């Protein structure tokens, strides 16, 4: 995990 | 205690069951018996005895006037749906060619029908069948437009409000502009002849048009525009209507000290007069949740899209839009809850029930189609990434493919190039070609997100933020372009503290990208220097997490009407 | 030119032949022995006024570029205007 | 003597939308204009099959990746006629 | 309203570029480089595609005047010709073709 | 365009006319079947004479609701228009019995 | 462009709105009327104001008549059981209940009872609603056998006729073989009083009865009395029955160049006659493919599958037996088809379809559901083995050995121990557990399957000879017994080219099987000799395979009826 | 494959 939230 | 049933509750069993003979006479039965007669059919399950009256309109005038069991004839009528028989399509077009029949008449007959059509055409679009409630409001409007006088003005104004609200949850966004168009001729000629119209609830309905086709810019003007037209003497489903859809274009307005107490408000008036079960109260904690989510109040935000969904469930049946709907922004907000986790297994149900029930009811090419299966798409390349087996991971991330592109394809041919939507599936297609091993493709799908959401939101926003943090782990973790990497970071950095502080829970993957990022350009000074901040985010983060449920955060009797409005104009 | 279309209760509705010949079984009566009088002996005249306000209806709406309207059949009227329509196969 | 005259050229589909992706059929895939409108354009061929159910090459492509059949008709797919 | 300025300058650049009224190719190539980064990159794109297509077709029309010498059989078209090929998706020279034609012997 | 029938005592005249014609022409319609002079016939829509001068769009038979599907009426006179017949009056099915 | 809506198809619009002031006053209208009226409101998606319209058979024996139209009928019909409503149940009560109403009333007025009989019970049976289809003629059947002279004879064997096809195509086997003994007493009494039937429908149906049970020689030998019982004056549904019925008999009895005249023959009668998209005409295809299938143009066979479920499926809707049957066999010949190639994934989805639909109209105890289970795991096994999952390998093989385990257990229940089609269900499962990791019982199952078939048939017929290949496969591969399997690939490769020649597909899977079987045995010379014929069984591969559309192949044979029946009988 | 096809 390392992008975060997808929006 | 084995307490023995009403009289009446005897009299419905046995009329019920001796329906056959009984069908004649029971429609001619008062609307308060004859709806419970109606109801005990769907509880004894025939549907087939219920729905053969439902499809003629004037029976379902008047089990339409029951307005205390209102929420017993949507679970009824959900029912109808699911079974089988198109309840809603053909009340629909049984109310139509009616009402073309009554055209040359008097401004009696054609009053009487208006009025059922504006509780018919407000039952299929309150129960979702959006599609099935304008080709109503369509009629009740070429109703208004024969008499041109001051008193049909106001009622062809109140079909425009209405046919701009129906042709939004159907994702007819280039008809609601000629609406809303429509409907200002309709205002203006009524307004000028010594009558003023309240203009609150039709402005709402553009606060929630021009969102959706993502002009934020314009709609925050047309959200204080909106709120400048609140009047005590509205009702309160169009006050509570105002409100939730002032507080979305607040949220994305990224302003978020106004923004809640409109939505508070908003939440509060739908549960003191509409109770804890009506879908009036469920379609606010929705926008409730959209407030929750865009604040980084992610913990609490799915226990009130699952009271939402959970309220939904109830009273809309199985397969209906307003559930799948709910299905859906549960689904995505379990995914942001438990991305970190990185177990998706409720969230997946959930999203893929979202696409199980609207590809059931709206066709292959629809807008609302295509949100809802970016959701299942966000899953699926997550789990495609927990997956240990080489086979699994690539067939699913493939899957994923399909699904960003069949739901960019959907929002380009609508919202266009320049618009967020589009750019946010740039954004989420960017994020999956970097699963996909596609660093090079990756790279120009971020270029086009950023840059469509710099031109149209501006330099320094929040989505413009969340975006280029998914292209600078695209340029430090996979591309070792540090250099390029540093100043994205940085950039997310600022405006991710701009509006959440050092505490925002989605800085987690800015600090510890910034880490990596000076693990392999040396200055191990500076590791440590971000080292203690990622500690600081610990301790800013978890203090701050212990709060109340959000259901009670509003309480009973946190402010009044006319007060929260005139405090938000001001501001 | 003129076809004069009596009913069973002799009431008569004469219209332009070329209209008149949308329905098929006119034009088998107006052909063989006898642009004249033809017996409607079954056919009410309350229900023959809409076929014959259907005939100008068909003939110009035909390619129409605009949308037709809906051509308006009463309900008191519906069932026994639909006999008529497959009698004269209109 | 001399003359001069255009072409609209087309494909032979019929149908006019690339079924999977629900673009237009003359105009590019839905994975070319995603990245770049130029770069790949011009290779954005059409592809036939038994049925006779013409799709983006790109399209068609993406389909076989994961599925094994034509979208329209669920029978088996076989190129024929690649534009 | 930029997109009604796009169909207006398309149904106008269909009509200047085919009857061969042009300052100079590369001056249309100019033009139309300029909105694809002034406006948008997939604005410019039918645009983009009325032009390349007179570009090749005089590669096309060396090929196919080739063609013909290169064929087997002696045969002669007579009355010379040359042919621009035309995007049915991209021209707005589609209109309604609803009229049929039959030409004649000559050509 | 404006389509309207003409009844005198049960002959019905489905001929159309355009809006903007006088009663004038519209009377010589009349006589091409009924053979009958034209002086001699008049009209009564709504039991009112129309005038010769005005045109069509001067009697309220405006092209908007002379609809082919449902005509606007117009009388004629040498009124006697008897009805053409009373259709099954259907139940209400919601009234009480 | 917009043409302006016809006025009866306006007024129906208009008399569908006002059901409710009409509902009992349409009954009174033509009976083309009444149709057109009641398929508005399946049009208009009132399903469940026209489920309360035919659960009547008062009304719907009126709607039944229209024939014109019974294309759209069967669609309207079958998407009302699916729907949720009993049509076909409730038509069947309401029929016996007339019938046993009428019983004691006048034979004469008997006789009308008899022809709404017909029509609703060859409609119920045109739809794949046997099991209650078969109330409708049994209460025929009583109703016309209670008085006993010339004129109830002729129609007792027409009902006793509709009830062996209602019976044997229900998997009502053991009832159908006492159904013909009842035939046998009134053609008897037919007989005896001077009058000829023709028993071409009833000895053709027989033989579909025979080839259900296995008993393909006594199927066979029926045909015969079958055959020459087809005159000028039978009925074209008829004579495409016997011909159908007889093809399926002379295919399993290896026997293809007889059997491609009549089922070449039957397309083309049902073509001529019963337009193109006729359900019998997807009854033909559905056996023609079954021909093309057992002579190997199996590249060609899933394209009349094709061509006879996309028939099923636009007559009749889904969830019903006849659109179940028209996926099972395509299931089927898409999983020979794609055997080499990999690619089930369509040959799954029409088996899952075919599973889901059976599942939901029949009863888990019928046959029926036998057939469809086995051709499910059969796709299932080898995606297992295509698959690079032990996980998935094991549960999948796991399925598909519950799916035979239950395909057995129900063949088992109607047919028994020593019928071919349970024996095939032990070769199906003897190759799942060559992939199953129980070897030593492989084994067991194939030899238990291999001495059924040859109890049956012989030590000469093709169906034999594929679990022969696939026992001596198991040798070669898991039993490491190389001396008994070269016994069994010779036997093998012998019949092949025997009955269908140098080019039959499975001389891959033995060539192949020998050029290991040799590898490891020592002999090295050899290997080169099947070496070179597999590559001349390649060589003439390329020649032989002609991929032509039968559909088209059967477009205008230039031979009738007659010379067909009897070019049969001649050879025979 | 090592079988021959299903039967
Ligand atoms: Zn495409
Ligand atoms: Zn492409
Ligand atoms: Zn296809
Ligand atoms: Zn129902």
Known sequence: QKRASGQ | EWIPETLYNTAISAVVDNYIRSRRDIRSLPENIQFDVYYKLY???????????????????????????????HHCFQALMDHGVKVASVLAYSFSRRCSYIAESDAAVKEKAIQVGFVLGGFLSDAGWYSDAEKVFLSCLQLCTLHDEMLHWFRAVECCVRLLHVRNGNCKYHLGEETFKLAQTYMDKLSKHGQQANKAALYGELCALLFAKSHYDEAYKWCIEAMKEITAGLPVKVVVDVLRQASKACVVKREFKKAEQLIKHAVYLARDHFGSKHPKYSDTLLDYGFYLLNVDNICQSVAIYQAALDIRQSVFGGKNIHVATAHEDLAYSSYVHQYSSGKFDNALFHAERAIGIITHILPEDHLLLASSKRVKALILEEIAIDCHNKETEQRLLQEAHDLHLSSLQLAKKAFGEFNVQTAKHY????????????????????????????????????????????????????????????????????????????????????????????????????????????????????????????????????????????????? | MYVKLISSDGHEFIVKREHALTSGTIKAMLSGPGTNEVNFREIPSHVLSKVCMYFTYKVRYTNSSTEIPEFPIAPEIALELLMAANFLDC | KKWNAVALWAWDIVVDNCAICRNHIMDLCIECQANQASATSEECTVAWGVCNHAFHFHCISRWLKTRQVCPLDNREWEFQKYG | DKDVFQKFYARML??????????????????????????????????????????VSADLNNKFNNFIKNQDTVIDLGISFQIYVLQAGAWPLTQAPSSTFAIPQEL | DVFLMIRRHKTTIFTDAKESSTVFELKRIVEGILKRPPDEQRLYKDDQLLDDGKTLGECGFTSQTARPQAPATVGLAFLCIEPFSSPPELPDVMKPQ
Chains 1, 8 share one sequence.
């Open chain 2, 43 to 73: 509880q004894q399950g025939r549907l087939c005895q219920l729905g053969s009256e439902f499809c003629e309109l004037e029976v379902f005038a008047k089990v339409l006037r029951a307005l205390d069991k209102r929420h017993l004839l």
């Open chain 2, 427 to 571: 954004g989420n297609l960017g994020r999956l070609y970097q699963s996909m091993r596609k660093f090079k493709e990756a790279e120009e799908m971020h270029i086009k997100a950023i840059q469509i959401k710099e031109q149209l939101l501006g330099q320094e926003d929040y989505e413009v933020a969340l975006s280029v943090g998914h292209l600078a782990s695209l340029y430090n973790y996979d591309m070792n372009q540090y250099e390029n990497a540093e100043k994205l970071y940085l950039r997310s950095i600022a405006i991710g503290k701009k509006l959440f502080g050092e505490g925002y829970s989605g800085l987690e993957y800015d600090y510890r990208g910034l880490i990596k990022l000076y693990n392999s350009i040396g200055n191990y000074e500076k590791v440590f220097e971000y080292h203690n901040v990622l500690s600081n985010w610990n301790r800013l983060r978890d203090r701050q997490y212990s709060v109340t449920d959000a259901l009670e955060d509003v309480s009973t009797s946190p402010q009044s009407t006319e007060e929260v409005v005139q405090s938000f104009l001001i501001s």
């Open chain 5, 14 to 55: 269909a009509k200047r570029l085919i009857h061969g009224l042009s300052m100079s190719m590369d001056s249309e190539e100019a033009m139309i480089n300029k909105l694809k980064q002034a406006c948008g990159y997939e604005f410019t794109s039918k645009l983009h595609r009325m032009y390349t297509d007179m570009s």
